[model samples]
Target: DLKGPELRILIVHARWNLQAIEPLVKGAVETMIEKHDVKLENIDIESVPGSYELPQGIRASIARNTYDAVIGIGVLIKGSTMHFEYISEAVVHGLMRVGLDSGVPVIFGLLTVLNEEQALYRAGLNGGHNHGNDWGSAAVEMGLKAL
Candidate 1:
């Protein structure tokens, strides 16, 4: 239930798993526009190759005080190797560090699903997962709280 404050948010999303990632991007954008009264120009949307690279982008944004908040969206699925575990932990912790170190709110919209179906499901209908909307609200809430 936040009102507009002429705020700007940096959306740092990944370019992986479009079959599922698109919904998250859409959900976040829709919520930010329709519910948060955030205009397109007010939102600075950026993309990295994958989840592993998201933290650097976010840290750069926060370093310059370029936005009121940041929403990082990515998809990491489990594999036979430990790739998922490492990246998931790295991203989660890296975002935490960036937020704490920068004194800015960082929203985690990254999804770590076990399989493609689950990924599709979470991207939430034209969406696979409800995580998109759920996290979208959280991003706004956190930003408003910062204000």
Candidate 2:
């Protein structure tokens, strides 16, 4: 078994496409609480204004040096503009860099979907794999591994 004190998780959520992202966040939270026996209070939930801001939010949270694991959640749906690709790639790349630099278990939960419908489908509200389960499982697994 992994040896560590009580685990703490940080969840950075994007408020931009909340309609599609909220369910994913809900699923992730439920999984962590139920499957991993993580206390709700032990988890810190922060909201960023947009997907592009997630890495900064994550970096700030890590700078506090509190959580054992951090999960960045967002939904970027493609539009006529090239902004989607740019933001999505930057978010993922930034999270990776943060995790590497901080030596913290940072799980990328952001969903880069082709459309809102696809985002909803993965969020598990409309039906499919449990979105919460994905992030929650990764957080639990990584937290234990880190220990």
- Model 2, 53-109: lDDT tens per residue? 999999998897688899999888899999988988888899999999999999988
The lDDT of model 2 is: 0.84
User: Each candidate: what lDDT?
Assistant: 0.83, 0.84
Model 1 segments more than 4 A misplaced: 126-129
What TM value does model 2 have?
Answer: 0.93
Q: Give the alpha carbon lDDT tens digit for every residue of 34-60 in model 1.
A: 887877788887888999999998887
Q: Cα RMSD for candidate 2?
A: 2.0
TM-score of each: 0.92, 0.93
Model 1 lowest lDDT segment of ten: 125-134
Separate clash counts for every candidate? 11, 2
| Cα lDDT, model 1, residue 78 | 99
